[PDB]
């Protein structure tokens, strides 16, 4: 259990003898075969004996890189013959959403998706030398709840750190402070997209303004006062 701030090129405080499972932020040189950081962030490690150890670097970023097993929100920008063309983020490369990657998929019927539709899918292919692929159903487990068209509502652009701390970290006091003001449904995308929706447009807009203000403010204990003032402003 160690967490320290590191920099690209700094020494790696891990013994080579111990088995390691590196992830994002850490690179393996194809020549020197050494392990070096390539990102500026907090270095997280966890030594457990059951007996594998993992290590990764949590860095600040806004450009999303397609990685497998990620929950992403995309916009349909093209309809090909055997797949869709989805945009997980502006300016970034496109991803492939096949017509067969849907619940109860069949060659006979095509999905009812058209261009401009917000979809919620899982990254099933994230090869570096190939185009990334998504799917509206987990092809490994069969899950399909929540995946599909996000009809209406409003999408929000946040950084990648705000997306992971909202989907995985259950202690993030955002969905709790928002539900205390109005009922809503949220869709968390790891590509920096947060889709919200309420009954009235006045509540959906208030959710858009809180997540935007809470995205730039790093003080987590100030989320209660943000929504307290934001939901009060829409009453005039």
């Amino acid at each position: 259990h160690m967490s320290t701030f590191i920099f690209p090129g700094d020494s790696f405080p891990v013994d080579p003898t111990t088995p390691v499972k590196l992830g994002p932020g850490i690179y393996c040189d194809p020549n020197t075969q050494e392990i070096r950081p390539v990102n500026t962030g907090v270095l997280h490690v966890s030594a457990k004996g059951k007996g594998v150890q993992t290590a990764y670097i949590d860095y600040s970023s806004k450009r999303y890189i397609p990685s497998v097993n990620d929950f992403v929100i995309g916009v349909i920008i093209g309809t090909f013959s055997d797949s869709y063309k989805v945009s997980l983020q502006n300016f970034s490369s496109s991803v492939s959403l096949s017509y067969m990657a849907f619940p109860n998929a069949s060659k006979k019927n095509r999905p009812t998706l058209q261009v401009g539709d917000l979809v919620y899918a899982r990254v099933c292919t994230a090869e570096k030398e190939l185009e990334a692929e998504i799917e509206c159903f987990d092809s490994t487990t069969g899950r399909d709840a929540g995946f599909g068209i996000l009809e209406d509502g409003m999408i929000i652009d946040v950084n990648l750190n705000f997306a992971r701390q909202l989907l995985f970290n259950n202690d993030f006091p955002l969905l709790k402070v928002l539900a205390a003001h109005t009922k809503f449904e949220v869709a968390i995308g790891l590509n920096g997209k947060i889709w919200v929706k309420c009954e009235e447009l006045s509540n959906t807009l208030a959710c858009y303004r809180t997540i935007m203000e809470c995205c730039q403010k790093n003080d987590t204990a100030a989320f209660k006062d943000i929504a307290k003032r934001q939901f009060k402003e829409i009453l005039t």
Binding site: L22, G23, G146, A179, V186
Partner: peptide, 29 residues
């Protein structure tokens, strides 16, 4: 020479182990 497993993403490093709901509808209250 080291004990190297391919660089994994951000999701596989967590503890819920894929029992996470990305789209949570907050009803009532």
């Amino acid at each position: 020479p080291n004990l190297i497993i391919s660089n994994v993403g951000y999701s596989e490093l967590r503890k819920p182990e894929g029992v996470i709901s990305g789209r949570k509808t907050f009803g009532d209250n």
